[PDB]
């Protein structure tokens, strides 16, 4: 997007996490060890 609201792809997810997309292009995030799934980007947790 023109504003780049997303956290840049160069910033890795936390260890043990992966990102996926729906068929409509919506991002979601998988936490392997807790087997949890969320729409919220975990990388925002590290913003000041």
UniProtKB/Swiss-Prot annotation:
Induction: Induced in the hours following cyclic mechanical strain in keratinocytes. Residues 11-44 form the WW domain. Phosphorylated by LATS1 and LATS2; leading to cytoplasmic translocation and inactivation. Phosphorylated by ABL1; leading to YAP1 stabilization, enhanced interaction with TP73 and recruitment onto proapoptotic genes; in response to DNA damage. It comes from the Eukaryota. It is found in: Cytoplasm; Nucleus; Cell junction, Tight junction; Cell membrane. Increased expression seen in some liver and prostate cancers. Isoforms lacking the transactivation domain found in striatal neurons of patients with Huntington disease (at protein level). The first coiled-coil region mediates most of the interaction with TEAD transcription factors. Part of a complex when phosphorylated that contains DSG3, PKP1, YAP1 and YWHAG; the complex is required for localization of DSG3 and YAP1 to the cell membrane in keratinocytes. Binds to the SH3 domain of the YES kinase. Binds to WBP1 and WBP2. Binds, in vitro, through the WW1 domain, to neural isoforms of ENAH that contain the PPSY motif. The phosphorylated form interacts with YWHAB. Interacts (via WW domains) with LATS1 (via PPxY motif 2). Interacts with LATS2. Interacts with TEAD1, TEAD2, TEAD3 and TEAD4. Interacts with TP73. Interacts with RUNX1. Interacts with HCK. Transcriptional regulator with dual roles as a coactivator and corepressor. Critical downstream regulatory target in the Hippo signaling pathway, crucial for organ size control and tumor suppression by restricting proliferation and promoting apoptosis. The Hippo signaling pathway core involves a kinase cascade featuring STK3/MST2 and STK4/MST1, along with its regulatory partner SAV1, which phosphorylates and activates LATS1/2 in complex with their regulatory protein, MOB1. This activation leads to the phosphorylation and inactivation of the YAP1 oncoprotein and WWTR1/TAZ. Belongs to the YAP1 family. It is linked to Coloboma, ocular, with or without hearing impairment, cleft lip/palate, and/or impaired intellectual development: An autosomal dominant disease characterized by uveal colobomata, microphthalmia, cataract and cleft lip/palate. Considerable variability is observed among patients, uveal colobomata being the most constant feature. Some patients manifest intellectual disability of varying degree and/or sensorineural, mid-frequency hearing loss. This is Transcriptional coactivator YAP1. It comes from Homo sapiens (Human). The chain holds residues 165 to 208 of 504 of the full protein.
């Amino acid at each position: 997007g023109a504003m780049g609201f997303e956290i840049p792809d160069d910033v890795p997810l936390p260890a043990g996490w992966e990102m996926a997309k729906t068929s409509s292009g919506q991002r979601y995030f998988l936490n392997h060890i807790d087997q949890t799934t969320t729409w919220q980007d975990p990388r925002k947790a590290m913003l000041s």
